[PDB]
Amino acid sequence: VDEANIETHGMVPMNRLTDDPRWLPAMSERVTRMVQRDRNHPSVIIWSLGNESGHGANHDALYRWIKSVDPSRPVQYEGGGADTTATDIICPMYARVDEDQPFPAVPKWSIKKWLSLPGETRPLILCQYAHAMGNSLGGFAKYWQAFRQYPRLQGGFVWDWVDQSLIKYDENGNPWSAYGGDFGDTPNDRQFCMNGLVFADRTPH
């Protein structure tokens, strides 16, 4: 999945820049210039309009731009409820197998319920599931049971591969794995950079 370098997660709402036409130029260069560079690679099967930036009208514009200039690949985008007009795939992040999380505007339905909502035609492939932060991947079996039972459940992408720990050296030059704040960075989100199936040195969890 080749993803454009667009994330506006910290805007309030997440929509603020991606729905503004004054940001459509900046956003189009990050989508279009990706397609122009990577369009010949067979490994790329799906284009992504970015991550966690709500759902703005610029998303719908650039979705249709990709469709027009490269019909050979589906386009996906999770923002604004995972099933917007700018996605060919229902690509939720952390939608649970049986339990609904009915957040206002942007609900995370049961992946099994989500398929059968009236008028919903598309496959579902979680762009992110099974958050692997420390001692986790509890209930991972429950996804794959559901994946195998339901044809339109075609799997997902685990979040994620590598702990984003950095090496620091103490006063005597011993290396140790550091996370949020360990460099005087404030504010910070501490451990939440470490979500990997493997440690930073690629040792398996």
40 binds, among a copy of itself, Na ion, none (CB under 5 to 8 A by kind): none
Residues 78-137 that bind a copy of itself (CB under 8 A): 100, 110, 112-113, 115-118, 121
Q: Candidates 28-36, 77-85, 150-158, 180-188 — which segment interacts with a copy of itself by CB under 8 A? A: 150-158
Count residues near Na ion (CB under 5 A): 3
Which residues of the chain form beta strands (DSSP E)?
A: 2-3, 47-48, 75-76, 124-129, 153-158, 166-169, 175-178
List 68, 72, 135, 149, residue binding a copy of itself (CB under 8 A):
149
| N-to-C CA span, the chain | 24
Count residues near a copy of itself (CB under 8 A): 13
Question: Which residue, 118 or 184, has its beta carbon nearer to a copy of itself?
Answer: 118
For the chain, what is the radius of gyration of the CA atoms? 19
List 30, 39, 67, 152, residue binding a copy of itself (CB under 8 A):
152
Give min distance, CB of 153 to a copy of itself, in A. Answer: 8
Question: Which residue, 73 or 131, has its beta carbon nearer to Na ion?
Answer: 131
Give the separation between CA 90 and CA 18, rounded to whole angstroms.
20
3-class secondary structure, 167: strand
**Do strands 166-169 and 175-178 pair parallel, antiparallel, or not at all (unpaired)?**
antiparallel
Give the separation between CA 43 and CA 96, rounded to whole angstroms.
29
Q: Is residue 53 within the footprint of Na ion (CB under 5 A)?
A: no
List 58, 87, 165, 195, residue binding Na ion (CB under 5 A):
195
Q: Candidates 1-9, 91-99, 135-143, 153-161 — which segment interacts with Na ion by CB under 5 A? A: 153-161
Beta bridge partners of 162: 198
Give the separation between CA 132 and CA 138, rounded to whole angstroms.
9
Give the separation between CA 39 and CA 51, rounded to whole angstroms.
20
How many Cβ atoms are within 10 Å of 186's Cβ, its own excluded? 7
Give min distance, CB of 191 to Na ion, in A. Answer: 9
Under the rule (CB under 5 A), what is the footprint of Na ion? 153, 192, 195
Under the rule (CB under 8 A), what is the footprint of a copy of itself? 100, 110, 112-113, 115-118, 121, 149-152
